[PDB]
């Protein structure tokens, strides 16, 4: 007689995962409902929609809300957990991240869906004109804030998705953030140091594609 989340989606971390992660930060437990592409068919006609991810909580009041729409309900989330920032100049660095992070997340997503055939080429494109560019944004708005954490010295929506972007990136086109922005794998190395919750679920979680 309580809260309870469930979040929707498919078995791949793509648009769900910043969710997930903002949860295990905040330490807060829920069901974590990951189904297959072959059962989706018939999931699909019941939600609103017709898209995933789906967040249902379900409140202290015992009613539902079904919420869509991935970074609209990360950020509803992280509000409720003061986790987007404690000043409107770091809710400010927070957008400015994830803003970055979206077209981040959106070149090597495109990546990921080019056939094994045209997919080098792809990744010459990123290599040489908008993956440093992109880059060279997040390096310089993270260095600003002291390379530790996006806003303020604690764990915000902005570091997680950023820790997210950056593992498609390494995973699309590896050894680039390696070779190319050291401060960004460092980035991604140590900030489960600052959520050991993170470094225990990253650790058992299953390894997918995207
Ligand atoms: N911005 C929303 C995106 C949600 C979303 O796209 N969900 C996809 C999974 S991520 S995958 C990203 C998504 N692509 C797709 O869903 C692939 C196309 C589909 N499978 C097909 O058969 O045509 C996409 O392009 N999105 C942005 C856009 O529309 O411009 C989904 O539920 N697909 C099941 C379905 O539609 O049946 C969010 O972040 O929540
Ligand atoms: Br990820
Ligand atoms: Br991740
Ligand atoms: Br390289
Ligand atoms: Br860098």
């Not at 970074?71 to 970055?100: H, N, P, S, V, W």
């Not at 260095?143 to 303020?152: C, D, L």
């Amino acid at each position: 007689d309580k809260q309870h989340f469930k979040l929707w989606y498919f078995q791949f971390r793509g648009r769900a995962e910043p969710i997930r992660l903002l949860l295990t930060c905040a330490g807060v437990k829920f069901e974590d409902y990951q189904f297959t592409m072959d059962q989706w068919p018939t999931i699909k006609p019941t939600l609103p929609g017709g898209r995933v991810p789906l967040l249902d909580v379900t409140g202290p009041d015992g009613k539902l809300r079904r919420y869509q729409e991935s970074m609209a309900i990360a950020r509803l989330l992280a509000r409720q957990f003061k986790m987007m920032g404690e000043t409107d100049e770091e809710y400010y660095l927070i957008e400015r991240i994830i803003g970055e992070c979206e077209d981040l997340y959106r070149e090597v997503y495109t990546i990921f869906r080019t056939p094994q055939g045209e997919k080098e080429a792809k990744i010459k494109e990123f290599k040489e004109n908008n993956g440093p560019t992109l880059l060279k944004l997040v390096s310089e708005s993270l260095e600003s804030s002291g390379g530790k954490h996006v806003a303020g010295n604690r764990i915000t929506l902005g570091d997680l998705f950023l820790f997210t972007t950056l593992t498609h990136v390494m995973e699309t086109v590896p050894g680039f953030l390696e070779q190319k922005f050291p401060k960004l794998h460092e980035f991604h190395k140590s900030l489960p140091t600052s959520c050991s919750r993170l470094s225990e679920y990253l650790k058992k979680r299953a390894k997918t594609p995207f």
